Amino acid sequence: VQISKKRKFVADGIFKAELNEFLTRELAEDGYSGVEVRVTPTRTEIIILATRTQNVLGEKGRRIRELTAVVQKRFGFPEGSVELYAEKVATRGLCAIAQAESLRYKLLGGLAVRRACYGVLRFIMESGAKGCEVVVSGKLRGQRAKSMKFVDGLMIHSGDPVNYYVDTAVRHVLLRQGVLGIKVKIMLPWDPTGKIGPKKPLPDHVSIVEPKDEILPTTPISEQK
Amino acid sequence: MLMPKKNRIAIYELLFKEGVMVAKKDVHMPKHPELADKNVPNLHVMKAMQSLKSRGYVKEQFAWRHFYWYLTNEGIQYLRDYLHLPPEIVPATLRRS
RNA sequence: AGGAGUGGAGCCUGCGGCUUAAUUUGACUCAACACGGGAAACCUCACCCGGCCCGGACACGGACAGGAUUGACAGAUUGAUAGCUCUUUCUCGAUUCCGUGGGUGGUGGUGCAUGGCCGUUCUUAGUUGGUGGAGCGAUUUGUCUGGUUAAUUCCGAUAACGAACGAGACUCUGGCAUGCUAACUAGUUACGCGACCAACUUCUUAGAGGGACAAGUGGCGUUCAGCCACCCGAGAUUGAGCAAUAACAGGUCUGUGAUGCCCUUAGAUGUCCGGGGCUGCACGCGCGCUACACUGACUGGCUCAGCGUGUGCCUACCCUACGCCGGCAGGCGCGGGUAACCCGUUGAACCCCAUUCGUGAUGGGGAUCGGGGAUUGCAAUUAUUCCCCAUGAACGAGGAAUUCCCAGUAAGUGCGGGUCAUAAGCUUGCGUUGAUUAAGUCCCUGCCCUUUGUACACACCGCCCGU
C-alpha cells in the first residue's frame, strides 16, 4: 500500500523502462521513437512518439485499444485507468531510435547495406543534423565478421556534452545468416527553443555579437527640406 | 502435458471468455499474482495454456518475463471445428469502441 | 646512496600440481587464479558411493472402459515417514510409453559464425579527410627546425591552406563566505517562568550566485609561449567520471525467443529441511587474515564521526527503542520508523587513562585449547553464534624472488552497502589516527613526438647458416 520514496522512484523508473521496451518490441515497424509518461492528478497519461501514426492507431483505433487494454491488465492499474496517445515527432530525421529502426527495416528485406546506410546518413544530414555516424557490424559472408562505418559531419565522443548533444541507438538486425548490430549516432544542432537540439551551446564555443557596416561622414549635419 | 480433459474444457471456456490476455510463466509456485483464485489448479491451467500457445499453430513471443498474445483466426477455426461453437455468440470485448 | 608497508608473528579462499564418491565448467603473463559480482550441504555440484516422476507440429511401426502417477512406519532400502522392497491387484483416472531429430528446448556445442557489452593494445598524445604542392608509383607534405606544455598544449616557423576527432574545455566531487534565499526535526535578546540563601534565517540542511585568472610583484625566456619564487589568499600543476577510425580470431552462446545448426543421452545437467567430498597438511601455485615502548593498552573521570540501509505486483524473509537476570546482544510481552520525524545527537568501540614496564621477557601486544547463559540457523563438526582463570608461543626490521604507494599517499583502525537467513576471511564505499622518504632519472621494465639500419611483414617468439 505504501513504499519508501527511494523504492517508489526506482519502481517508477522500472515501469518506464519496461513500458519503453514493451512498445519497442511491439511496434518497431511503426516508426516508434520513444515514450513519455506524464503525471496528472490520480491519472497516468502516456504519449507515444512515432513517425507513422495511422499504423499505430490503425482502423477504428484497433491497435490502440488492444495495447492500451494489455498495458492496463499488465501494469496493475485499476480498471480503465491507462490512456495512451500517439503523436508525430517533429524531429524524425535526427532521432537515433527512428533512424535505427529505418535502417533495420531497410536491411530486414535483404538489401545492400552501403546504399541503405548512405541513404539514412544523407537523410539525417538533410534533416539539419550537425553530424552523424552509422556503424553496421556483423556477417558479410566468409569465415569472419566485419564492421563498416559511415560518417559525415562533425561529432564529439568525450565529456559531458556527449550526454545532451549526441543521441545513440543500438539495434539488432536478424538475417538468415545471423545477427548484425547497427549503431546510429546523431550530433544534434544547437537551437534555442523548439526542442530540436540542446539549449546550451558547446562549452568550448565562445560567441561574439557581430557589428555592422559603418561608412559615415566626418560630422553629423542635420538636414531639413 | 499431463493434462486432464475437465481442466481442458475449463481452460477452453477461459479462452472463450477472455480472448485478449496477459500472463507470466509460472509453474511450481502455489499462489499467483493475477491469475489465481480461479477454482482450478494453477499448474494445470498454465500447462493447458502452454498447450494452447505452443502446440504448433499459434505463434508467441517471450520477453520481459511476460506474455502478450495475438490469437489468430486459425485457432478460432480450430476451436469452432472441434467444439462446434459458432462465432454468432460474439465476444463481449466489442464494447467501448 | 630514497624509503614506508611487504608473502614469513595473530579471522581461508580461488584453481592446477595432486589414492577410489576429493581436487570438481569458463578463464594458458601483464590482458587467468574470493575473477564469472561464483560466500560449493541443498533449489545453482557436471569430480559425486545412488534415482524417479521422462518428449516429440512428423516422418513409420506395437492398438482401447485399463496399456500406471510424486503418493505405507513394524522382515527392509544402501543414509532418507521415497510403494524401488522379485511386495498391495489401495489410489487424478484414456492421461500416456519404446526405437532416430528438427520441436513447446537443452546453464547442450561452436565467443575460430555473430550481435551487444566489456577488457587490452594505450594513460599515453595520438589520428584523418578536402583542395593545393612532391613522386611513375606505393606513398609523402599538411601532422614541422626550435622553444614551451601534462598534452599534436601553445608560440613560432613554414608548399601548404582550411578543417575534423582525441587533449583541453565539460559533468560530478572536495575546499571558502562579519553575503543572499528560510526551516514547530540544529538556533536564540532586560511588561519570561520551573530559579536574589511570532530574531525576514546566519553553525546543520541545499539554491538562482560569488570566488582563482599564473591575476599582482621579482627573476629567468629571438623579452613569444611559458617557467621559477614570493606576498595576498579558503584555496596558486588541485579526487573522479567521460573519453580518437585500424587493432585482438582477447572474454562472454553459463545474463538475455539477442542469435546462425554440424550433434550425445533418458543417468532432462528440471524439483524434493533430503544426500561424499573440496573445512586434507610431505604445501604445487595465486589474492588474503597481522606493528617493534612510558607511543601499546583499563581509569569510564568532559558535549565525538560517517558514507549509508531499513517492512506485499512478486512476498512466506525489514531497522530497531524495557524487563525474566547469571554481569550486558538476549528463548517471551512491549512501542517507533515506508524514514533530516524511529533506530540515532548511530545501544556489549577513541585512544586515551591514580591497574604500568627504570631498562627490557615484566604487568607490555596472545600457540592451541575447558566452563556461565548460547541471538535460536534440522545439519555447521562434513563454513552461523560473547568476555573472563593471566595455561607462556624464533615473545622487539625477515631464502632466492618481488607487489603497491608521493598528503589527509602509505599504514593502523573500526563501520556501512552487495552477496544475505542481522550469513564476510571478499569486494565496494565511509570516516578516525596519521604519515618516514622524494619534487628526481632514464640505470632496470616499459611508452611516446625524430633520425638511422634491416636479408623482418605470421613483422625478433622474425628470418636464417652449418657434416
Number of helices followed by number of strands (H, E) in chain B: 3, 3
- The answer to whether A81 CB is within 7 Å of strand C is no
CA–chain centroid gap for A103, Å, is 14
Grid coordinates representing B2? Answer: 499431463
For this experimental structure, what is the resolution in angstroms? Answer: 2.7
Per DSSP, A76 falls in state T
C-alpha A21/C-alpha A50 separation (Å) is: 15
Given its phi and psi angles, is residue B85 left (phi above 0), alpha (psi -120 to 50 degrees) or beta? beta
Contact predicate B9/B43, CB 8 Å: no
Residue from the list B20, B61, B96 with its beta carbon closest to the beta carbon of A66: B20
Is the Cβ atom of A141 within 7 Å of strand C at any atom?
Answer: no
Cβ neighbours for B66, distance < 8 A, ≥ 6 positions apart: A74, B22, B23, B24
Structure-block grid coordinates of residue A215: 561608412
How many Å apart are CA A128 and CA A120, to the nearest integer? 13
Write the residue in B34, B64, B97 that is nearest to A21 by C-beta: B64
Are the beta carbons of A214 and A204 closer than 8 angstroms?
Answer: no
Sheet holding A131-139, edge to edge: A145-153, A131-139, A179-187, A166-174
| Residues of B at the A interface, defined by Cβ within 8 angstroms | 20-22, 34, 61, 63-64, 66, 68, 96-97
Per residue, the 3-state secondary structure of A97-165, as one string, reads HHHHHHHHHHHCCCCCHHHHHHHHHHHHHCCCCCEEEEEEEEECCCCCEEEEEEEEECCCCCCCHHHHH
Q: Domains, chain A, ranges and CATH?
A: 1-90 (3.30.300.20), 91-225 (3.30.1140.32)
- Nucleic strand C contacts from chain A, 96-135, CB < 7 Å: 131, 135
Q: Which set of grid coordinates corresponds to residue A202?
A: 558547446
The method recorded for this entry reads cryo-EM
Strand, coil or helix: what is B42? Answer: helix
Domains of chain B: 3-97 (1.10.10.10)
Distance CA A62, CA A178 (A): 34
Nearest to A73 by CA among B11, B31, B43, B23: B23
Cβ within 8 Å, pair B22-A73: yes
